[PDB]
Design a protein around this ligand. Structure first.
Ligand SMILES: CN(C)[C@@H]1C(O)=C(C(N)=O)C(=O)[C@@]2(O)C(O)=C3C(=O)c4c(O)ccc(Cl)c4[C@@](C)(O)[C@H]3C[C@@H]12
Ligand SMILES: CN(C)[C@@H]1C(O)=C(C(N)=O)C(=O)[C@@]2(O)C(O)=C3C(=O)c4c(O)ccc(Cl)c4[C@@](C)(O)[C@H]3C[C@@H]12
Ligand SMILES: [Mg+2]
Ligand SMILES: [Mg+2]
Lengths: 198, 198
């Protein structure tokens, strides 16, 4: 096996799709790579080091809308950025549980710094721009996690029976997209209100 | 040990606080209860059966605002219900990862049926009332999961340094509460718009 960082990240992503996150271990990864575990240890010290790097790589590889287009509104940037974030988290089995708990890596510093500056340039204070960006992140992580965990870990009253048919009718994309519009409209109301009672 | 359902759920909650969810196993629970694992098997068939029952019990025990008060508005019910849901999920180590992926249990049928009927009585269609209730659930699960997983699994530019001080200044409660108001205001805009272009 070639054991530079990119081929270790590639076999580990491959293995996450096959086993999920609880079945991903350095002993299984060494066997996939066809090397002994001391050989693997030289490259990958532990499972946290590995999950930290996968969380960065899945967004580097798949999260394409990380910055505003030139002249794009803050509303449009949040919509687009959230949908790209959903799409990157859903690309791999347990992608959202791999993200959970990470913080921006050094490789992401400039990207996330730009996102926050862009909201302050749009009128938000830093804290309000942060609370908007975080509410979009938490709603998206929540929606993808319920979806992915629902299919991993596997007498009704009339409206629940029907709620359950609706829920299960697609990937959760329509419920997501409609909730996203409500979130962005609530922030716009708050932005424009300024100091008036809203 | 007494091994009726309530004392097994009690020792298992106790054990979840000590070990977290990945260290919670029927072998560790049998040792906590001081019985042999065949004795435990008669009562608890497996870890999924156990996590399913804990997800129901933590809300039964701690989620107190599950129904609207008499005369309460839909806005106020969503605010209060979300905060109670956050509070119940945060009461135990990995409480939100225990919830993840469950669906309403038979013991919760009447409660969730009422919640959906209440939104349709407030003007929502069933699907729109469902999308509002789900967006509140997903945002709350997302915010508590990022919080709990951030503390479990353990050169900055100026606005990220400052974002990071703000984030970490409390439990995530202010970011949660502010995002909650934006979500509820976005649904109200959408409810009242009816068929007009909004
Ligand atoms: C999904 N989108 C809203 C963000 C995004 O697109 C990111 C990105 N690298 O392109 C993120 O890292 C993010 O997805 C993301 O994961 C962020 C993040 O985790 C976070 C945390 O943990 C603490 C402080 C801060 Cl400043 C952040 C924060 C706001 O930078 C976010 C940004 C979101
Ligand atoms: C946090 N709050 C919005 C809800 C709540 O308070 C519940 C409760 N038992 O009191 C739930 O079970 C909920 O927290 C909760 O977990 C629900 C839930 O999981 C869910 C899923 O999985 C699929 C279909 C439906 Cl109809 C539901 C649904 C909308 O009943 C929700 C309700 C939320
Ligand atoms: Mg993140
Ligand atoms: Mg639920």
């Amino acid at each position: 096996a070639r054991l530079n960082r990119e081929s270790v990240i590639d076999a580990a992503l491959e293995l996450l799709n096959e086993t999920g996150i609880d079945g991903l271990t350095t002993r299984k990864l060494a066997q996939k790579l066809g090397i002994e575990q001391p050989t693997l240890y030289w490259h990958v010290k532990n499972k946290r080091a590995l999950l930290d790097a996968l969380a960065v790589e899945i967004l580097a590889r798949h999260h394409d809308y990380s910055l505003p287009a030139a002249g794009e509104s803050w509303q449009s940037f949040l919509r687009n950025n959230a949908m790209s974030f959903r799409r990157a988290l859903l690309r791999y089995r347990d992608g959202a549980k791999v993200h959970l708990g990470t913080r921006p890596d050094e490789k992401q510093y400039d990207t996330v710094e730009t996102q926050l500056r862009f909201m302050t340039e749009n009128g938000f204070s830093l804290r309000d721009g942060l609370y908007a960006i975080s509410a979009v992140s938490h709603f998206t992580l929540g929606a993808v996690l319920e979806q992915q965990e629902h299919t991993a870990a596997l007498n009704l009253p009339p409206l629940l029976r029907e709620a359950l048919q609706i829920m299960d009718s697609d990937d959760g994309e329509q419920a997501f997209l409609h909730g996203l519009e409500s979130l962005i409209r609530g922030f716009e109301v708050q932005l424009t209100a300024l100091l008036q009672i809203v």
